[PDB]
């Protein structure tokens, strides 16, 4: 079991629980400890790795899952590979980017998101999966320059068979207009895919600001840094996105670079108020693959 693991250092804490860096047979591993209030998030994220056999170069790599439960207490561990460089959010604050490194990040995310979204058939197939909490803090930077998508505790699934949610359980800063509007068609699975594309558009913006061009770059800032306070409320986001119909502003420098200009058009096509008008994960991958 994973009782042979040494918990060295805590790297993340929050409502979900905690994530620890740990050692196991000489190798660093990440250990997510779920509080007993997140037990269903533990099982869901485990079942995707345990039963659906979720694996992809840009999805966080599962290692093991353990639950031990007495009447005294219950422990819930999810064990995955460890990524020293941390989250895309931490990375972007300490690093600038160039044409190649930026593309590798962006295309890497689009590849992981599209594999999540696309249903696969057969004995080794997978249902369509919606993340529902895409954001820079849930994307990890790998040593090789690529990224992988991490937290799947809120993901939903859809297969070719009648069948996974009630409402709005994501990070409010990244919620799409139809979520803040409550216009979202909760009964159409594509609705949740289009929510991810909105979040992915914000992450594209975050990354692009950090790509240097013509000797200039932008400090890191979160989406909507200029119009909402830290930890914005549901009403604050609805006012900026729906009523004021605000969108992250595009610096004028982006248009003097080919890469940044292509990204700008991609972002905007992820931000249409109408979800049906937004690009798909696959077409975002294709477009990104053709750049440079």
Ligand X SMILES: COc1cc(-c2cncc(-c3ccc(N4CCNCC4)cc3)c2C)ccc1C(N)=O
Residues annotated within the binding site for ATP are: 11-19, 32
> Cα(first)–Cα(last) distance of the chain, in Å?
47
Q: Is 66 a catalytic residue?
A: no
176 in Cβ contact with 182 (< 8 Å):
no
Among the listed residues 4, 66, 98, 133, the single catalytic one is: 133
124 in Cβ contact with 53 (< 8 Å):
yes
Tell me how far, at minimum, the Cβ of 162 lies from ligand X, in Å: 29
Residue 159: phi and psi, rounded to 5, are -125, 170
Most distant pair of Cα atoms in the chain: their distance: 64
Q: Identify which of residues 96 and 99 has a Cβ nearer to ligand X in the complex.
A: 96
> What sign does the dihedral 204-208-210-211 (CA atoms) show?
positive
Cα separation, 169 vs 265, whole angstroms: 28
DSSP 8-state symbol, 14: S
The residue among 132, 152, 108, 115 whose CA lies nearest residue 197 is: 132
Q: Identify which of residues 206 and 257 has a Cβ nearer to ligand X in the complex.
A: 206
Tell me how far, at minimum, the Cβ of 285 lies from ligand X, in Å: 23
Annotated binding-site ranges: 11-19, 32
86 binds ligand X (CB under 6 A): yes
30 binds ligand X (CB under 6 A): yes
61 binds ligand X (CB under 6 A): no
Among 18, 47, 66, 90, binds ligand X (CB under 6 A): 90
Among 5, 11, 155, 260, binds ligand X (CB under 6 A): 11
Residues of the shown chain interacting with ligand X in the complex, contacts defined by CB under 6 A: 11-12, 19, 30-32, 45, 60, 78, 80, 82-83, 86-87, 90, 140, 150-151
Any idea which residues carry the catalytic annotation? 133
């Amino acid at each position: 079991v994973a009782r042979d693991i040494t918990l060295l250092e805590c790297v993340g804490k929050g409502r979900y629980g905690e994530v620890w860096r740990g050692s196991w047979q000489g190798e660093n591993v990440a250990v997510k400890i779920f509080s007993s209030r997140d037990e269903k998030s533990w099982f869901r994220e485990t079942e995707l790795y345990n039963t659906v056999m979720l694996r992809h170069e840009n999805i966080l790599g599962f290692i093991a899952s353990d639950m031990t439960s007495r009447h005294s207490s219950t422990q819930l561990w999810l064990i995955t590979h460890y990524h020293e460089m941390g989250s895309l959010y931490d990375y972007l604050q300490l690093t600038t980017l160039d044409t190649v490194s930026c593309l590798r990040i962006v295309l890497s995310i689009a590849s992981g998101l599209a594999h999540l979204h696309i249903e696969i058939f057969g004995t080794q197939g997978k249902p369509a999966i919606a993340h529902r909490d895409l954001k820079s803090k849930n994307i990890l930077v790998k040593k090789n320059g690529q990224c992988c998508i991490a937290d799947l505790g809120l993901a939903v699934m859809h297969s070719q068979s009648t069948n996974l949610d009630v409402p709005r359980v994501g990070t409010k800063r990244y919620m799409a207009p139809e979520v803040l509007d409550e216009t979202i068609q909760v009964d159409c699975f594509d609705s949740y895919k289009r929510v991810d594309i909105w979040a992915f558009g914000l992450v594209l913006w975050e990354v692009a600001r950090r790509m240097v061009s013509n000797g200039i770059v932008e400090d890191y800032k979160p989406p909507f840094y200029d119009v909402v306070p830290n930890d914005p409320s549901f009403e604050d986001m609805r006012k900026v996105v729906c009523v004021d119909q605000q969108r992250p502003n595009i610096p004028n420098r982006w248009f003097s670079d080919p890469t940044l200009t292509s990204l700008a058009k991609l972002m905007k096509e992820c931000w249409y108020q109408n979800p049906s008008a937004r690009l798909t994960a696959l077409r975002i991958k294709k477009t990104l693959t053709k750049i440079d």
